Amino acid sequence: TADAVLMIEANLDDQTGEGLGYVMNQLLTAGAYDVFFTPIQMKKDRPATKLTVLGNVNDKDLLTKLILQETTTIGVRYQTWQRTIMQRHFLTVATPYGDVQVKVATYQDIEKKMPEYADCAQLAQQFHIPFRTVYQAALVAVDQ
Amino acid sequence: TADAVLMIEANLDDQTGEGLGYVMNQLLTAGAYDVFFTPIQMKKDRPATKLTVLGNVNDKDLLTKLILQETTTIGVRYQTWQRTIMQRHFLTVATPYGDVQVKVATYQDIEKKMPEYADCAQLAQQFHIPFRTVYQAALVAVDQ
Amino acid sequence: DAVLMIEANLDDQTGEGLGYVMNQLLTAGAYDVFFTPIQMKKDRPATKLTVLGNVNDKDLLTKLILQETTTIGVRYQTWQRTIMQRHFLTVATPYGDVQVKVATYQDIEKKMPEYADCAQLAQQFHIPFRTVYQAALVAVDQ
Amino acid sequence: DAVLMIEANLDDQTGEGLGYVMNQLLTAGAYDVFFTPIQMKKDRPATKLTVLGNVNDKDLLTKLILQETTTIGVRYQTWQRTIMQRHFLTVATPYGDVQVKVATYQDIEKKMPEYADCAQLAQQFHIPFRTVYQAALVAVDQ
Amino acid sequence: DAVLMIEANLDDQTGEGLGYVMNQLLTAGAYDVFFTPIQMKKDRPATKLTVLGNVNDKDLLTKLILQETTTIGVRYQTWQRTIMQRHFLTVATPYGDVQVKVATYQDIEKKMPEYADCAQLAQQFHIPFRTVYQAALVAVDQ
Amino acid sequence: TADAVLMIEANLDDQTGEGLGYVMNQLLTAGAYDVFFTPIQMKKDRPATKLTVLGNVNDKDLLTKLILQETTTIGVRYQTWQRTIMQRHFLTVATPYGDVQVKVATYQDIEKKMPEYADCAQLAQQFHIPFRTVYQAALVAVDQ
Ligand SMILES: Nc1ccn([C@@H]2O[C@H](COP(=O)(O)OP(=O)(O)OP(=O)(O)O)[C@@H](O)[C@H]2O)c(=O)n1
Ligand SMILES: Nc1ccn([C@@H]2O[C@H](COP(=O)(O)OP(=O)(O)OP(=O)(O)O)[C@@H](O)[C@H]2O)c(=O)n1
Ligand SMILES: Nc1ccn([C@@H]2O[C@H](COP(=O)(O)OP(=O)(O)OP(=O)(O)O)[C@@H](O)[C@H]2O)c(=O)n1
Ligand SMILES: Nc1ccn([C@@H]2O[C@H](COP(=O)(O)OP(=O)(O)OP(=O)(O)O)[C@@H](O)[C@H]2O)c(=O)n1
Ligand SMILES: Nc1ccn([C@@H]2O[C@H](COP(=O)(O)OP(=O)(O)OP(=O)(O)O)[C@@H](O)[C@H]2O)c(=O)n1
Ligand SMILES: Nc1ccn([C@@H]2O[C@H](COP(=O)(O)OP(=O)(O)OP(=O)(O)O)[C@@H](O)[C@H]2O)c(=O)n1
Ligand SMILES: [Cl-]
Ligand SMILES: [Cl-]
Ligand SMILES: [Cl-]
Ligand SMILES: [Cl-]
Ligand SMILES: [Cl-]
Ligand SMILES: [Cl-]
Ligand SMILES: [Cl-]
Ligand SMILES: [Mn+2]
Ligand SMILES: [Mn+2]
Ligand SMILES: [Mn+2]
Ligand SMILES: [Mn+2]
Ligand SMILES: [Mn+2]
Ligand SMILES: [Mn+2]
Ligand SMILES: [Mn+2]
Ligand SMILES: [Mn+2]
Ligand SMILES: [Mn+2]
Ligand SMILES: [Mn+2]
Ligand SMILES: [Mn+2]
Ligand SMILES: [Mn+2]
Ligand SMILES: [Mn+2]
Ligand SMILES: [Mn+2]
Ligand SMILES: [Mn+2]
Ligand SMILES: [Mn+2]
Ligand SMILES: [Mn+2]
Ligand SMILES: [Mn+2]
């Protein structure tokens, strides 16, 4: 239920968006819990991007080294956050378009059920149905 | 003068803006010092929102539970910040349009005086005057 | 039916003032008002204000912007639009009736439960907004 | 050659859904698709969707937006454009050939190594993307 | 008096380069230049560049953009504008004279103390910018 | 290689962009390692700016006091981040347009070389060449 997460950041005013899209995908294949970009505004009228990576506290060296190798930054800053995470498991749910996996999260008496995006998007593509139509059909089916 | 503040964050790529506007207002009625949204850019070409909540360090359970109940997130991250806060009190200031409350903040020999928005906005609405006209009239009156 | 778009960049106004003008503009009958974060000269974080409205409301919306913001001028233009046909359905849920906007286009049909109904009933019955939103989707499903 | 721009503001759709529609629109032949973060009424963080495309693809791109997003209508307009002349050069590097887009305008000449080639070879040879990008610049220099 | 707007999306240029082009464009006589953060294909954080200027400066501003940025083309259009009447007042403060822009529209009258004067005197007299700005408002009040 | 950095933040919904551009430059002349702005979305439909300042851990009082004097904020929050920084030195590199300084950063066996912006921008201005043309000429020359 309770763990910790490492957050690593770096500001980039000297790298292309092309290069940043590449490193986002390098970081996820490296096992980062999450990667995101925040538009920031830096000195000398430069539009810039802040890179944030969340990962296991023990992955400090891995993620740091990846960032210094693949981005233009000279340094990284990092710090540990505490976390509260719900318990999670999966249910196979039958819908009008086929089976969809649904993540079931519980925390004390809080409970929510989230259809898997990739499952819904594949079925929307296959059957030429809007993604939102399939996702909602999965939500109805979850209501069971 | 010196205290600490708890910061709680969560990234949301699976929730509507409608839902986020609702939770912002749920969080403030719950006693959060501040709530804000930051546009971020997440994996799989998803535009997302980071939710940040500042509050009392002792409100960890309250604010965490509210977020997990009202948002789609599976976990939250949180951490404690130190703070330096000016001393604050209120003055009733008479202006050409009626009384306006002004927050007077002092820190060592730093001092600034901030007219209350709601007081100025009500009077601008009532008398059909631009908000900035009333706010500046309150700033002049503060100069006393 | 065409729409008027009015824009103005603001680097010399507080956020407090901008929240005020959004609500003045909405009560004046603007179709929509939104802010876009921009970055302007001399290292200024700024905001672009966009107002969408009826073309015949050009003078009203212009006047409010020039009165309530710091901008010296506004720029405007008309956009053509394509709008789906729209009607509303009221659906019964365990929490009361919820109106659902039903939009159609050619062979498109989609359903957006009304925000005001889901939020009102969510507060009233002390349940998450998503709980009421989903019950309206279930109710629609029959 | 003119370009069509289509816009729609979305405060009632998930990011997951928006990533899906960007890829539907790109596979439909849109020139470009991008998102702009906006701030809408009632404290809603929102996204503006912009689609750039061929003017003759107006009905296709409109239909996809109204089918796959939550918007009730779209607004559109045509922009004039000025486009540089463009050709491609293949340059030999220690990692293989890399195509380079060469754009010219009057007396302007500039070189952008092709992203797909630099990324493919960077993964293949386990070197940073910038390492391959720079080697293509060196290769261009002779 | 109408205004020209030129746009271009950039996912393949550094921020360093973009700060350079903003200052080239301003010295070339652009009315305004600003950046808007956008999100483009293939998970790229990007920047939209907007240039506002005189319609007769279309070719100059286009040439600078195609020379100094990575974009292959630009899109442009003309917006109509409504501009308030404007004049300037010099007001005496404890820190020197400060020019105040006075803008009027119908029965609107508003006052924006000039940034360059408040900033120059704030540095000169080692006081906050807001302190000089407010003293100009007081000075205006009589 | 390994140090720490102090991060100070403040949200501003009651200050002009003009005022923020001024304080960014006040902060850099004060010796901040970095200053940046993040657009955020605050209560009551206010578009706002978050101010972030990175600096030496021992500059807490300096940077705090500057912010409370020059911005509208009533308080600041701050916290210490750990950092991993590459070793850095400078090389004078001869290019087709004159000498350009290049920062050479190394970390274990990671190495990258970054031409100085001001050197390239001056030469682009002087010789009426695009900045990107000069910067790339410096990158080629670095490849040595
Ligand atoms: N910051 C995060 C985000 C992810 N997770 C965990 O890692 C998994 C990945 O989250 P998710 O968004 O579901 O990843 P994917 O399934 O790969 O992608 P998608 O968003 O399409 O579902 C989740 O189960 C979550 O519990 C985490 O620990 N920390
Ligand atoms: N991050 C924050 C922001 C607020 N405050 C305190 O909480 C009060 C709320 O701040 P304020 O913005 O003034 O709230 P309101 O008065 O409700 O709204 P408004 O902005 O319109 O004045 C302030 O006095 C401030 O001292 C705080 O401790 N931490
Ligand atoms: N860009 C827009 C936005 C709105 N409208 C018109 O304005 C009405 C109000 O729009 P909406 O945002 O839905 O207002 P509410 O329903 O009050 O807000 P909510 O999103 O909470 O449902 C719409 O039905 C539509 O007719 C429009 O024509 N063009
Ligand atoms: N605003 C735009 C964007 C694209 N195009 C056309 O679409 C093509 C594809 O654009 P691009 O972004 O370069 O696609 P890719 O080359 O596939 O992507 P990448 O950036 O990775 O090279 C361009 O050559 C151009 O002819 C256009 O006319 N107008
Ligand atoms: N969108 C714009 C912006 C500027 N201008 C013209 O350009 C002049 C310069 O604009 P401004 O931003 O005020 O320049 P400065 O006064 O130099 O900058 P500052 O904001 O620091 O006062 C204005 O007076 C106006 O005539 C314009 O016509 N259209
Ligand atoms: N957050 C940061 C950023 C800067 N630095 C250090 O401070 C110096 C300033 O960084 P840089 O961006 O190179 O500053 P300038 O050279 O002044 O400006 P420019 O970006 O144009 O090179 C760098 O050498 C870097 O090592 C730092 O310690 N912490
Ligand atoms: Cl750092
Ligand atoms: Cl997290
Ligand atoms: Cl304008
Ligand atoms: Cl726009
Ligand atoms: Cl519209
Ligand atoms: Cl274009
Ligand atoms: Cl705070
Ligand atoms: Mn730098
Ligand atoms: Mn099955
Ligand atoms: Mn998943
Ligand atoms: Mn997810
Ligand atoms: Mn009284
Ligand atoms: Mn207050
Ligand atoms: Mn100005
Ligand atoms: Mn509605
Ligand atoms: Mn009740
Ligand atoms: Mn709506
Ligand atoms: Mn290409
Ligand atoms: Mn391999
Ligand atoms: Mn491209
Ligand atoms: Mn001026
Ligand atoms: Mn001095
Ligand atoms: Mn406030
Ligand atoms: Mn020499
Ligand atoms: Mn430098």
**What is the per-residue DSSP string for chain E?**
--EEEEEEEESSS-HHHHHHHHHHHHHTT-SEEEEEEEEETTTEEEEEEEEEE-GGGHHHHHHHHHHHSS-SEEEEEEEEEEE-EEEEEEEEETTEEEEEEEEEETTEEEEEE-HHHHHHHHHHHT--HHHHHHHHHHHHH-
Burial of A31 (0-12, 13-18, 19+ CB in 10 A): exposed
Nearest to C12 among E52, E86, E112 (CB): E112
The answer on E95 and E117 residing in a single domain is: yes
Residue F92 CA to ligand 31 center (angstroms) comes to 13
Question: Which residues in chain D have their CB less than 8 angstroms from residue C81's CB?
Answer: 73-76
Q: Measured between alpha carbons, how far is B36 from F42 in angstroms, rounded to an integer? A: 5
CB atoms within 10 A of CB A57: 13
CB atoms within 10 A of CB A141: 19
Tell me if E32 CB under 6 Å of ligand 5: yes
Helix axes D115-125 and D129-141, enclosed angle (nearest 10): 120
Residue D11 CA to ligand 27 center (angstroms) comes to 36
The answer on D69 and D88 residing in a single domain is: no
The answer on A40 and A7 residing in a single domain is: yes
Q: Ligand 6 pocket: which of F24, F34, F53 to mutate (most atoms <8 Å of CB)?
A: F34
Distance (Å) from the C-alpha of residue F112 to the closest C-alpha of chain A?
A: 8
Helix axes E15-27 and F131-143, enclosed angle (nearest 10): 150
Nearest to C115 among B18, B121, B130 (CB): B18
Q: Measured between alpha carbons, how far is E114 from E90 in angstroms, rounded to an integer? A: 10
The answer on A100 and A69 residing in a single domain is: no
Instruction: Enter the tokens of residue E56.
Output: 């007769």
The answer on A16 and A73 residing in a single domain is: yes
Sheet holding E108-113, edge to edge: E85-93, E96-105, E108-113
**What secondary structure does DSSP assign to C68-121, as a single string?**
HSS-SEEEEEEEEEEE-EEEEEEEEETTEEEEEEEEEETTEEEEEE-HHHHHHH
Closest residue in C to A43 (Cα) is C43
Spatial CA neighbour of B49 closest among B17, B80, B75: B17
Is the Cβ–Cβ distance between D55 and D78 less than 8 Å? yes
Distance (Å) from the C-alpha of residue E27 to the closest C-alpha of chain A?
A: 14
The values of phi and psi at residue C66, to 5°, are: -70, -25
Q: Choose one of F64, F83, F102: the last residue of a domain.
A: F83
Instruction: Enter the tokens of residue D95.
Output: 């990692």
Tell me if D34 CB under 6 Å of ligand 4: no
Q: Measured between alpha carbons, how far is F140 from D139 in angstroms, rounded to an integer? A: 9
State in Å, rounded, how far the first CA of chain D is from the last one. Answer: 34
Tell me if E109 CB under 6 Å of ligand 5: no
User: Which technique was used to obtain these atomic coordinates?
Assistant: X-ray
Q: Choose one of A65, A83, A101: the last residue of a domain.
A: A83
Spatial CA neighbour of E80 closest among C54, C59, C80: C59
The answer on F139 and F69 residing in a single domain is: no
The answer on D30 and D19 residing in a single domain is: yes
CA dihedral A58→A62→A65→A70, nearest 10 degrees, is -130
Q: Measured between alpha carbons, how far is D16 from B16 in angstroms, rounded to an integer? A: 10
The β-bridge partners of F114 are F103
Domain range holding C57?
1-81
Residue F117 CA to ligand 30 center (angstroms) comes to 18
Q: Measured between alpha carbons, how far is F90 from F104 in angstroms, rounded to an integer? A: 6
Partner-chain contact C42 A45, CB within 8 Å: yes
The answer on D90 and D42 residing in a single domain is: no
Length of chain B: 144
Q: Choose one of B35, B50, B83: the last residue of a domain.
A: B83
The conformation of residue C142, written as its DSSP 8-state character, comes to -
Helix axes A17-29 and D129-141, enclosed angle (nearest 10): 140
Distance of alpha carbon B79 from the chain centroid: 19
Distance of alpha carbon C41 from the chain centroid: 29
Phi-psi category of F130—alpha, beta or left, where left has phi over 0 and alpha has psi -120 to 50? beta
How many domains would you assign to chain E?
Answer: 2
The values of phi and psi at residue A49, to 5°, are: -130, 135
Q: Measured between alpha carbons, how far is C61 from C9 in angstroms, rounded to an integer? A: 15
Q: Which atom of ligand 5 is nearest to the CA of E86?
A: 24
The answer on A110 and A61 residing in a single domain is: no
Instruction: Enter the tokens of residue D91.
Output: 């340059």
Q: Measured between alpha carbons, how far is E3 from A117 in angstroms, rounded to an integer? A: 44
Spatial CA neighbour of E57 closest among E78, E40, E36, E71: E78
CA dihedral D99→D104→D110→D111, nearest 10 degrees, is 0
Q: Ligand 1 pocket: which of B11, B15, B74, B77 to mutate (most atoms <8 Å of CB)?
A: B74
Q: Measured between alpha carbons, how far is D97 from D88 in angstroms, rounded to an integer? A: 12
Alpha helix (H) ranges present in A30-96?
60-70
Q: Which atom of ligand 6 is nearest to the CA of A11?
A: 1
Closest residue in E to A20 (Cα) is E44
Strand pairing category for E85-93 and F98-107 = unpaired
Give the Å distances, CA to CA, from A133 to A124, F111, F119.
8, 50, 56
Nearest to E12 among A18, A44, A47 (CB): A18
Spatial CA neighbour of C129 closest among B75, F42, B69: B69
Helix H, strand E, coil C: the string for chain D is: CCEEEEEEEECCCCHHHHHHHHHHHHHCCCCEEEEEEEEECCCEEEEEEEEEECHHHHHHHHHHHHHHCCCCEEEEEEEEEEECEEEEEEEEECCEEEEEEEEEECCEEEEEECHHHHHHHHHHHCCCHHHHHHHHHHHHHC
Q: Measured between alpha carbons, how far is B51 from B78 in angstroms, rounded to an integer? A: 12
The answer on E114 and E131 residing in a single domain is: yes
Question: Which residues in chain A have their CB less than 8 angstroms from residue D122's CB?
Answer: 22
H-helix or E-strand spanning residue C1 = none
Q: Measured between alpha carbons, how far is C123 from C133 in angstroms, rounded to an integer? A: 13
The conformation of residue C28, written as its DSSP 8-state character, comes to T
**Portion 73-132 of B in contact with A at CB < 8 A:** 74-79
Is the Cβ–Cβ distance between C35 and C8 less than 8 Å? no
Q: E58-88 b/e with 16+ CB inside 10 Å = b?
A: beebbbbbbbbbbbbbbbbeebebbebeeee
Partner-chain contact E129 F69, CB within 8 Å: no
The conformation of residue B127, written as its DSSP 8-state character, comes to H
Maximum Cα–Cα distance across chain A: 57
The answer on B117 and B69 residing in a single domain is: no
The β-bridge partners of B94 are B99
The answer on E103 and E68 residing in a single domain is: no
Instruction: Enter the tokens of residue D62.
Output: 């409109």
* Half-sphere exposure for F113 (CA within 13 Å, toward CB): 18
State in Å, rounded, how far the first CA of chain A is from the last one. Answer: 27
Is the Cβ–Cβ distance between F81 and A79 less than 8 Å? yes
